[PDB]
Amino acid sequence: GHKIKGTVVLMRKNVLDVNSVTSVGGIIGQGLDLVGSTLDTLTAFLGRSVSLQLISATKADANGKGKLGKATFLEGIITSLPTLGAGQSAFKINFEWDDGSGIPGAFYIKNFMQTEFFLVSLTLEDIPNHGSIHFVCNSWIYNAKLFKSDRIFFANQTYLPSETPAPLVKYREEELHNLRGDGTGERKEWERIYDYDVYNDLGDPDKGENHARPVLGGNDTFPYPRRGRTGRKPTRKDPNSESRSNDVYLPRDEAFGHLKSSDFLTYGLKSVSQNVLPLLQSAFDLNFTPREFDSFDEVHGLYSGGIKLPTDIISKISPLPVLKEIFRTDGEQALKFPPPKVIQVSKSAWMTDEEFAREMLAGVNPNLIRCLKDFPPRSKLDSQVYGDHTSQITKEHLEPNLEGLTVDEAIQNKRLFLLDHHDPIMPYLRRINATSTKAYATRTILFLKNDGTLRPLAIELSLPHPQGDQSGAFSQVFLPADEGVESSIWLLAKAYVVVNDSCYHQLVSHWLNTHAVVEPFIIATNRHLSVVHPIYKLLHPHYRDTMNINGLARLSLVNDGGVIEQTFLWGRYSVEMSAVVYKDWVFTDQALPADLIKRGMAIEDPSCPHGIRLVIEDYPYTVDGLEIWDAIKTWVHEYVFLYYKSDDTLREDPELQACWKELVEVGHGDKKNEPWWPKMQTREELVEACAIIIWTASALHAAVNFGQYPYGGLILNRPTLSRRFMPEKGSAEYEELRKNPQKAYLKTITPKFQTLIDLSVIEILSRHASDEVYLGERDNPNWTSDTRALEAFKRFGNKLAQIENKLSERNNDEKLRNRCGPVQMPYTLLLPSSKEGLTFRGIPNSISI
Ligand SMILES: [Fe+2]
Numbered sequence: 014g015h016k017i018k019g020t021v022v023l024m025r026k027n028v029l030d031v032n033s034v035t036s037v038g039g040i041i042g043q044g045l046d047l048v049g050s051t052l053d054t055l056t057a058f059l060g061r062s063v064s065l066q067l068i069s070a071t072k073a074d075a076n077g078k079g080k081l082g083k084a085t086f087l088e089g090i091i092t093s094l095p096t097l098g099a100g101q102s103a104f105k106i107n108f109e110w111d112d113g114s115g116i117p118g119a120f121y122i123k124n125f126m127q128t129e130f131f132l133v134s135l136t137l138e139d140i141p142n143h144g145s146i147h148f149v150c151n152s153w154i155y156n157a158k159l160f161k162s163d164r165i166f167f168a169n170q171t172y173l174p175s176e177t178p179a180p181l182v183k184y185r186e187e188e189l190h191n192l193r194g195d196g197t198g199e200r201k202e203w204e205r206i207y208d209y210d211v212y213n214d215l216g217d218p219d220k221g222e223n224h225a226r227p228v229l230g231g232n233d234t235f236p237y238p239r240r241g242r243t244g245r246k247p248t249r250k251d252p253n254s255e256s257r258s259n260d261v262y263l264p265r266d267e268a269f270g271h272l273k274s275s276d277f278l279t280y281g282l283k284s285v286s287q288n289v290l291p292l293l294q295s296a297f298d299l300n301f302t303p304r305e306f307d308s309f310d311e312v313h314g315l316y317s318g319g320i321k322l323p324t325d326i327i328s329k330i331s332p333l334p335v336l337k338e339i340f341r342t343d344g345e346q347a348l349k350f351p352p353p354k355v356i357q358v359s360k361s362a363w364m365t366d367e368e369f370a371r372e373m374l375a376g377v378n379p380n381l382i383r384c385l386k387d388f389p390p391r392s393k394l395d396s397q398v399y400g401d402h403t404s405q406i407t408k409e410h411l412e413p414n415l416e417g418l419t420v421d422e423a424i425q426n427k428r429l430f431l432l433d434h435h436d437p438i439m440p441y442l443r444r445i446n447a448t449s450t451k452a453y454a455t456r457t458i459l460f461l462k463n464d465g466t467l468r469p470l471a472i473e474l475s476l477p478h479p480q481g482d483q484s485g486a487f488s489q490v491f492l493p494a495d496e497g498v499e500s501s502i503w504l505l506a507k508a509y510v511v512v513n514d515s516c517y518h519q520l521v522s523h524w525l526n527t528h529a530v531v532e533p534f535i536i537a538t539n540r541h542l543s544v545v546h547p548i549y550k551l552l553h554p555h556y557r558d559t560m561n562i563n564g565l566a567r568l569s570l571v572n573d574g575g576v577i578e579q580t581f582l583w584g585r586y587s588v589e590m591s592a593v594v595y596k597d598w599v600f601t602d603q604a605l606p607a608d609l610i611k612r613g614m615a616i617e618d619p620s621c622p623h624g625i626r627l628v629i630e631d632y633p634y635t636v637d638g639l640e641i642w643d644a645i646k647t648w649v650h651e652y653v654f655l656y657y658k659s660d661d662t663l664r665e666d667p668e669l670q671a672c673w674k675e676l677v678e679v680g681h682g683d684k685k686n687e688p689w690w691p692k693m694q695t696r697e698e699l700v701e702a703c704a705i706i707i708w709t710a711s712a713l714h715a716a717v718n719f720g721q722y723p724y725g726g727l728i729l730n731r732p733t734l735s736r737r738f739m740p741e742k743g744s745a746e747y748e749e750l751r752k753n754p755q756k757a758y759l760k761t762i763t764p765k766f767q768t769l770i771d772l773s774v775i776e777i778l779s780r781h782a783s784d785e786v787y788l789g790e791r792d793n794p795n796w797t798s799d800t801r802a803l804e805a806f807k808r809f810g811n812k813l814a815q816i817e818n819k820l821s822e823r824n825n826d827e828k829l830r831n832r833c834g835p836v837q838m839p840y841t842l843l844l845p846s847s848k849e850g851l852t853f854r855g856i857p858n859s860i861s862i
Contacts, residue, residue, distance in 0.1 A: 016110075021103065024102065036274075058104060067120050069180055071115030082108060082109065116146075213228045214257070219248050284334070289330055296322060306765050318343065327348065353723050355723060371467065371834045375832065383432075389405070405488040427628040430460070439454045455509055455513050515581065527710070537673075562862055638716065642704075648808075663694075663696055723851070785847070820844055
């Protein structure tokens with residue numbers, strides 16, 4: 014024989030678990046970095062605890078399968094390695110192997126040790142005339158009894174599903190079969206089974222009828238992407254709804270641990286819903302704060318002295334894990350909030366028309382604006398005569414002081430723009446306005462000035478039917494005003510728009526278009542692409558922690574009594590309205606250039622840098638996003654073409670073909686007959702599909718997510734709901750608008766209690782964990798032994814670092830006013846790198862928060 018030398022790196026559960034790690038939380042990657050010696054439970058791993066068994070890649074047994082070595086136990090502790098790193102522990106193991114058994118390509122592992130551990134890697138050396146073999150594992154290994162068929166890990170090498178090494182073919186297939194899981198059964202914590210189900214788990218019909226919520230997906234009225242199957246028992250009152258639980262399953266390895274408490278952000282969110290909200294609600298159902306803001310100064314005091322609570326309410330939020338690192342305190346009565354970047358230079362610049370318009374290009378929701386093609390604008394609604402008979406903005410509403418073009422000449426010269434929030438809310442408005450909320454369906458028209466800035470020209474506030482449903486829109490239109498009560502009216506008009514925009518952003522731009530729509534791709538990938546497949550490795554970093562934050566959203570955010578329903582305009586109709594909007598979702602229109610063209614914000618042009626020409630040059634989201642889109646596309650093209658020799662080779666790949674078919678027909682299965690799905694008959698289609706997935710998971714989510722507190726941490730700038738209609742004529746509220754307009758604004762928008770909820774949640778959502786892995790050429794360890802892919806990944810990051818410098822440069826260009834605004838807030842949201850915390854920058858690989 015020979016002895017093959019193995020090095021196993023693993024991490025203990027205590028080093029990664031929230032419950033244990035609450036006493037470990039300030040400047041991590043550290044602490045004499047855990048080498049595995051003096052606190053030392055490392056001896057427990059040594060005797061008859063953990064067995065590893067190598068599987069030959071080149072020598073088969075009687076019936077095709079790779080030859081098994083001898084199950085071998087960990088024989089010793091390695092105290093130090095130059096590459097060790099925090100929280101890790103290393104073990105030496107030596108394997109009996111000969112020439113005649115060939116080359117290992119996989120291994121089985123059994124944990125007999127009761128407590129699960131996180132296996133990081135195996136390195137094998139001293140194999141004659143062959144280099145070292147590396148296994149990247151990154152998986153939790155539960156007790157061996159729990160399993161039926163052992164945990165298996167493959168070496169570093171990427172192989173197309175000709176399945177390469179013949180002795181390994183059956184091992185590759187069987188593990189893919191184990192991951193699919195059969196389709197029945199209640200899922201358990203230690204399981205790694207990926208499957209699909211509809212969104213039937215958000216409501217709570219056992220609590221009553223008013224807690225039931227419609228099934229989303231699997232029907233034509235409310236189509237939806239699928240989510241991860243959790244197979245709990247159904248509810249008593251409804252066989253089609255899944256019963257609620259405080260713990261939701263996701264396939265183990267999709268839930269990431271952290272070395273630092275304070276990086277456990279989903280745990281912080283869960284605490285805000287469960288512990289913090291009922292406590293804070295007790296103080297309003299009490300007394301110790303007034304239930305309403307009375308001035309703008311009272312809102313600003315949130316970031317100064319904070320808001321005063323009593324000791325025992327604030328002593329029950331001061332020592333909770335994670336939240337004591339993200340909440341401030343002055344002694345023992347003040348809950349305080351960090352000042353949002355929007356007011357750091359100017360307290361009042363958000364009120365400006367310039368800033369209002371600039372946030373449509375560079376704000377939290379910079380994706381919706383479109384170029385006005387024809388005039389007035391029109392609705393896509395079926396047969397009511399605002400749709401059948403348009404918006405009520407006329408041509409004489411739009412002649413202020415700037416140009417004196419006709420409406421027709423501004424349209425000709427691409428100078429008129431539209432923010433249309435009319436259609437999604439319109440069919441639900443009567444129901445919405447029968448509750449505590451009072452809302453309008455809005456449209457706004459914007460004009461590109463000669464200085465390259467945008468200004469709002471008209472706001473249409475539309476209502477549905479004083480009598481009827483047929484006969485269309487009851488609309489009022491409002492015009493900019495500099496002074497008098499008319500400016501206060503105009504400011505309230507803008508508030509009704511932003512309230513529409515905030516809610517659309519939350520449910521559609523953020524929840525639907527990134528979180529919900531990405532989840533079926535994670536499921537399809539794991540069920541059908543082996544860990545060894547090139548395309549699995551390309552896509553994998555972009556899925557990190559997404560099923561985790563989504564499972565928490567189902568539990569705490571988007572559920573029947575939850576945060577979004579209590580905080581935002583659409584209320585109890587929030588999620589189902591986003592299913593209505595999903596009717597219009599098309600995969601290939603999510604590609605940044607396609608999106609820009611569809612909204613008329615760009616035109617096709619070969620002489621321009623990225624092949625498109627921008628109507629509106631200073632559109633910060635778009636100009637910056639186009640650099641990042643191209644860096645992603647180039648990376649994915651170079652990668653894809655490393656592996657697929659021809660279009661036939663891709664057509665022959667059974668794992669890719671099965672992946673895509675199940676994606677289209679099951680995961681986004683309500684859209685299975687749509688003609689725009691790429692077939693996967695061409696390498697170019699694989700490039701485009703992968704580019705769209707990575708764009709979505711990385712920069713699109715970053716752009717739409719990390720500005721939420723910096724722009725909307727002042728509730729005055731991004732209100733989430735409205736609760737009064739416009740003061741009319743000779744009202745007592747109109748007169749109140751004359752004498753005390755701050756109080757009239759405050760009475761229209763989100764109340765104080767729901768403001769505190771909104772701020773606490775979006776402060777968490779807008780934070781980067783310290784162990785975030787960024788686009789900025791980052792990966793976890795050493796994912797492949799293919800050096801051509803490593804070099805190509807290297808070029809991807811050098812391109813990203815060069816793009817970061819180009820973007821910083823643009824922020825210092827005085828000509829580019831939309832990048833900063835009157836609010837002097839440089840657009841850094843698409844800068845790839847970031848440090849940690851409430852940073853208005855940084856593009857994570859994945860939807861991680
Ligand atoms: Fe998010």
